[PDB]
Design a binder for this molecule. Structure first.
Ligand SMILES: [K+]
Ligand SMILES: [K+]
Ligand SMILES: [K+]
Ligand SMILES: [K+]
Ligand SMILES: [K+]
Ligand SMILES: [K+]
Ligand SMILES: [K+]
Ligand SMILES: [K+]
Ligand SMILES: [K+]
Ligand SMILES: [K+]
Ligand SMILES: [K+]
Ligand SMILES: [K+]
Ligand SMILES: [K+]
Ligand SMILES: [K+]
Ligand SMILES: [K+]
Ligand SMILES: [K+]
Ligand SMILES: [K+]
Ligand SMILES: [K+]
Ligand SMILES: [K+]
Ligand SMILES: [K+]
Ligand SMILES: [K+]
Ligand SMILES: [K+]
Ligand SMILES: [K+]
Ligand SMILES: [K+]
Ligand SMILES: [K+]
Ligand SMILES: [K+]
Ligand SMILES: [K+]
Ligand SMILES: [Mg+2]
Ligand SMILES: [Mg+2]
Ligand SMILES: [Mg+2]
Ligand SMILES: [Mg+2]
Ligand SMILES: [Mg+2]
Ligand SMILES: [Mg+2]
Ligand SMILES: [Mg+2]
Ligand SMILES: [Mg+2]
Ligand SMILES: [Mg+2]
Ligand SMILES: [Mg+2]
Ligand SMILES: [Mg+2]
Ligand SMILES: [Mg+2]
Ligand SMILES: [Mg+2]
Ligand SMILES: [Mg+2]
Ligand SMILES: [Mg+2]
Ligand SMILES: [Mg+2]
Ligand SMILES: [Mg+2]
Ligand SMILES: [Zn+2]
Ligand SMILES: [Zn+2]
Lengths: 101, 142, 81, 140, 128
RNA sequence: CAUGAGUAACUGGAGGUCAAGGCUGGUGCCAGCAUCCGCGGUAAUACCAGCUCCAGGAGUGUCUAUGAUGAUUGCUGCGAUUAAAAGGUCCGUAGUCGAAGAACAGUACUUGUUUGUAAUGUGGCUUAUCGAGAGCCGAAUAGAACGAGAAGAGUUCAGAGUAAGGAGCGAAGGAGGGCUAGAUUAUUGAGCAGCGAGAGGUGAAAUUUGAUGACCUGCUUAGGAGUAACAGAGGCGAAAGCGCUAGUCAAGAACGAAUCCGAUGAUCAAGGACGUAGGCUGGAGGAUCGAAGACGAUUAGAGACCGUAGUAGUUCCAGCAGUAAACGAUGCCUACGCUGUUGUGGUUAUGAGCACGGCAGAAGAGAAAUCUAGUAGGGCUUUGGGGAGAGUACGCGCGCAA
RNA sequence: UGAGUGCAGGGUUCUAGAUCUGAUACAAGUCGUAACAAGGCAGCUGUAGGAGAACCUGUAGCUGGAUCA
């Protein structure tokens, strides 16, 4: 029986879409189906900022950040616990997740 | 719906309820009839005659003054073309597509458009050669 | 019958599409425009498909667009039909 | 096909549909005259050539008593079942027996006996029911 | 294009189910007029106005509380006077009430008038 | 009419369907019974018998064809989202189906009168003791002759111009298509320079490569693919499919409006054109990835999964081929239909509309799950009829083969 | 006008045949364990190689998936 109204993907009014590759296992997954995750990570860890304050030559310094978008296939997303199995009424709830660091 | 594609557009223009006589205008009957026959001899299609009469001379639908239709007036004056103007515009588009494909042979989309166009020609031809408006052995310019 | 169904209010008329009514409505009309300066009068159609220039002075009086045509800044008009 | 002047189209279509029915198909397109008892005849005469036994299908547990018959009308050899309690004792090799159908729509196996399609009715011109119950005797 | 007499029937059947009292019907032919005029004679509909719009035509009608259902038959079968009672028993709910309408050389008539005038015709539609 | 007298029932059943016994004795998965479901392994209301009951009765059981059962052949009257079942997409002939207004004609259509039926059958009455039986009466099918009516169907017309179609005009929008000329990085390969011991790969390791200087960091170059992030329940295309920037060449969709022609139209056997990927025939080329083949590990064994390496292919031009879970598993035109919200492109009395969408309820519907599935004798094509064998055999048509 | 009968062929229906190759039933024999749980490498459709055997591997697709995010 049909488990989801949208077939588990975001394609509508189209024939075909570009593929992308999974970060964890390099499998091909369609772009409109892949699980997506955003990361904004400081170059320097929080446990070093108190040393940075005496190491730097400049009057003040702003740490550089690094930015990423990651893609996962279903198997990897479930195994890494980005997503979890949910009850028949919960399946319908849609909410934006946090940006990781 | 549309004949060669999946279209369902609805853009048309409303025909009036009654037609009267355009008393606001600034020419006589005989002047309007002269304007038409001049534009005809210069070689304009009858749909363009209609556009000019509305736009420049200020007459809607070009019949309220004349009690006669544009193509019938051209037959009375003897200015009738050799081929009906619709069938004529279909042969032109075919020629254009064949002239493109002659130099850009690789275009599968243009090939597709040609076979649609050609079908439409024959369907129109069979109408006119039943109403005796074309000779029975007429064939396309190709 | 219902009065609402046989005789709609003028509010209802104005909200509907020109074809989807008990009797279909003409939207295009004719006007007399007068030129700034030379004060000559030209007959024009609303929704014009052609750009039009004033008799005599040759100022462009009316510009054609995708919808209702645009009268040049200084000029003025009256509906005639 | 529902138009008022559509009768010809409708008739040809509906005729072609019927071949999907197994019943109509077999009568039309199968070999309906291959059988000793069937469309051809209600009963068949034949001579006994061997005595035989067969296991019942699961979950039953039995040996069923059967006879090899040469059919006079076709020269095929067929298996038949012998109905009654001591019935096998009433038949000798080279006796003549008359044979009968099991009562299904097509020739089909009945009950727990695998692949046997007929049963014995009379031996040497006399009813097997009378022979077994000792109401009458062999012609001798 | 849809059949005009079919369109008439679905338009009034749905509006009746939705408990509306009046409707506008958008494409009208000669037999559609005569059908509506029949329903008025037997008191199934109350008021009729016709709009002469120069685009086909349209009608505005008031429904009564007595109308349960109506329908057109397609195609329009030819019937002898011997045949009409077969169709009567197939379409109508009771032997006591309701109308089966037939076209004839004497206009539209009901299954009782067929006996009076001694004429078959072509089957058109029904209401009860 | 008159004499004797006192004779005269069987077939199939008794666990359920299905009317009528847990009765007594044998037998112990044996022997048998049972259309179907099922009984019997020592406590059998089902076998073999006794005894009582049941059903029809001068009759009752069995086998075999057929009609019904059966809306499981569907004109009346079934189905095709998931149970069996909508052709991968277009074009198109035969075929079936086709506006409003005003008029006209009678061959179908319906009906009158007259013909057209011995027996059988149908409605009756009369005589054999009764009842079939016999005898007499009346009306009748299809088919044909001559009249009548004109709603529907048909033919014509133009001081008529579809929320039917085609031609054309105006301003604009889009990863729709072909061609020409350019581009920022990245992955490999070579040259040269610096440095002097490990690099790679994994869950953990070994094959493997390095003092002929690896790895990493510079500068030079040579190629062949690709267009990250922006990027979405966004857009375009008949479908398959389409994502860097400029220039160029044809045609199409939608919108605005007092342009022109007038039935030109819907659906479609046969016939024709397109169709991801993998494959095949010839040419160009060859970075990355990698069927086959070869090793290293793991295991009872791995021929596999993992790692090292490696060929055909993967790219382009000219063609052949014709299949996909080619799927929203929902044919194409055309209707009638509740509300709220959010998009994309035009137009706007700024109130709204038109085309193409998404989402959330409701009411109905349905075996439910759910809703492209509500209402319905609108038109046309494809298609299913319990599992298997079988989408297989033989014949035929296309293809170089597959 | 022609019966009969020569000699070649065809069209139909049956039947023989060394040997090979399908299917079905095999109480329970031998070797593994491919599917159904994330079935121990998620499964399935097309196409192409390979292999005691279920099957395995490349390439494009689908969710009837283990994700309506
Ligand atoms: K697809
Ligand atoms: K998803
Ligand atoms: K158009
Ligand atoms: K079409
Ligand atoms: K097309
Ligand atoms: K179309
Ligand atoms: K069984
Ligand atoms: K008895
Ligand atoms: K008994
Ligand atoms: K007992
Ligand atoms: K069946
Ligand atoms: K039917
Ligand atoms: K096909
Ligand atoms: K029109
Ligand atoms: K271009
Ligand atoms: K290809
Ligand atoms: K290998
Ligand atoms: K090994
Ligand atoms: K490998
Ligand atoms: K490699
Ligand atoms: K091709
Ligand atoms: K082809
Ligand atoms: K297929
Ligand atoms: K669309
Ligand atoms: K259904
Ligand atoms: K074959
Ligand atoms: K597997
Ligand atoms: Mg009972
Ligand atoms: Mg019994
Ligand atoms: Mg059924
Ligand atoms: Mg299935
Ligand atoms: Mg199915
Ligand atoms: Mg299908
Ligand atoms: Mg009597
Ligand atoms: Mg008519
Ligand atoms: Mg070096
Ligand atoms: Mg980019
Ligand atoms: Mg267009
Ligand atoms: Mg290739
Ligand atoms: Mg189709
Ligand atoms: Mg079947
Ligand atoms: Mg397994
Ligand atoms: Mg597995
Ligand atoms: Mg499941
Ligand atoms: Zn992965
Ligand atoms: Zn001026």
């Amino acid at each position: 029986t049909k488990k989801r109204s949208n077939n588990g993907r975001s394609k509508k009014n189209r024939g075909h879409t570009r593929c992308v590759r999974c970060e964890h296992c390099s499998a091909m997954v369609p772009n409109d189906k892949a699980i997506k995750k955003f990361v904004v990570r400081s170059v320097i860890d929080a446990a070093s900022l108190d040393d940075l304050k005496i190491a730097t030559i400049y009057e003040e310094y702003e740490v550089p950040k690094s930015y990423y978008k990651l893609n996962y296939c279903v198997s990897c997303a479930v195994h890494i616990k980005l997503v979890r199995v949910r009850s028949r009424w919960e399946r319908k709830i849609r909410k934006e997740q946090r940006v990781s660091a | 719906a549309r004949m060669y594609s999946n279209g369902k557009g609805q853009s048309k223009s409303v025909t009036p309820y009654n037609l009267t006589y355009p008393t606001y205008i600034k020419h006589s009957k005989e002047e309007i009839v002269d304007v038409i026959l001049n534009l005809a001899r210069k070689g304009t299609p009858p749909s363009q005659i209609g556009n000019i009469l509305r736009d420049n001379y200020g007459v809607g639908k070009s019949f309220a003054v004349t009690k006669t239709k544009i193509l019938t007036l051209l037959k009375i004056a003897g200015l009738k073309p050799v081929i009906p103007e619709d069938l004529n515009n279909i042969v032109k588009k075919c020629v254009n597509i064949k002239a493109h494909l002659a130099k850009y042979t690789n275009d599968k989309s243009s090939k597709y458009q040609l076979i649609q166009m050609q079908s439409c020609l024959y369907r129109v031809a069979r109408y006119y050669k039943s109403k005796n408006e074309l000779p029975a052995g007429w064939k396309p310019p190709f | 019958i219902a009065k609402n169904l046989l005789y709609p209010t003028v509010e209802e008329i104005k909200k509907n599409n020109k074809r989807k009514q008990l009797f279909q409505e003409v939207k295009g009309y004719f006007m007399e425009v007068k030129c700034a300066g030379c004060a000559t009068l030209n007959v024009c159609y609303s929704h014009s498909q052609k750009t039009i220039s004033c008799k005599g002075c040759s100022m462009v009086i009316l510009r054609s667009t995708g919808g209702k045509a645009k009268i040049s800044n200084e000029c003025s008009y009256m509906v005639i039909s | 096909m529902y138009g008022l002047l559509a009768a010809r189209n409708l008739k040809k279509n509906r005729h072609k549909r019927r071949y999907a029915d197994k019943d109509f198909a077999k009568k039309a397109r199968g070999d309906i005259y291959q059988n000793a008892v069937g469309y051809s005849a209600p009963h068949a005469k034949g001579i006994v050539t061997e005595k035989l036994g067969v296991e019942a299908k699961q979950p039953n547990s039995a040996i069923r008593k059967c006879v090899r018959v040469h059919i006079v009308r076709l020269n095929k050899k067929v298996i038949a079942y012998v109905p009654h309690d001591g019935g096998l004792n009433q038949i000798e090799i080279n006796d003549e027996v008359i044979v009968e159908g099991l009562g299904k729509k097509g020739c089909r196996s009945k009950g727990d006996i695998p692949g046997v399609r007929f049963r014995v009715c009379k031996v040497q011109k006399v009813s097997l029911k009378a022979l077994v119950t000792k109401k009458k005797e062999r012609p001798a | 294009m849809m059949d005009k007499l079919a369109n008439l029937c679905i338009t009034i059947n749905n509006a009746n189910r939705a408990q509306k009292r009046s409707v506008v019907i958008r494409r009208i032919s000669k037999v559609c007029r005569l059908f509506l005029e029949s329903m008025q004679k037997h008191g199934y509909i109350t008021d009729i106005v016709y709009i002469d719009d120069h685009r086909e035509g349209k009608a505005v009608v008031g429904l009564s509380g007595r109308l349960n259902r109506c329908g057109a038959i397609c195609p329009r079968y030819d019937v002898e006077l011997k045949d009409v009672e077969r169709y009567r028993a197939n379409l109508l709910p009771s032997r006591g009430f309701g109308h089966l309408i037939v076209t004839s050389s004497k206009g539209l008539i009901d299954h009782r008038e067929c006996i009076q005038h001694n004429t078959g015709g072509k089957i058109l539609g029904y209401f009860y």
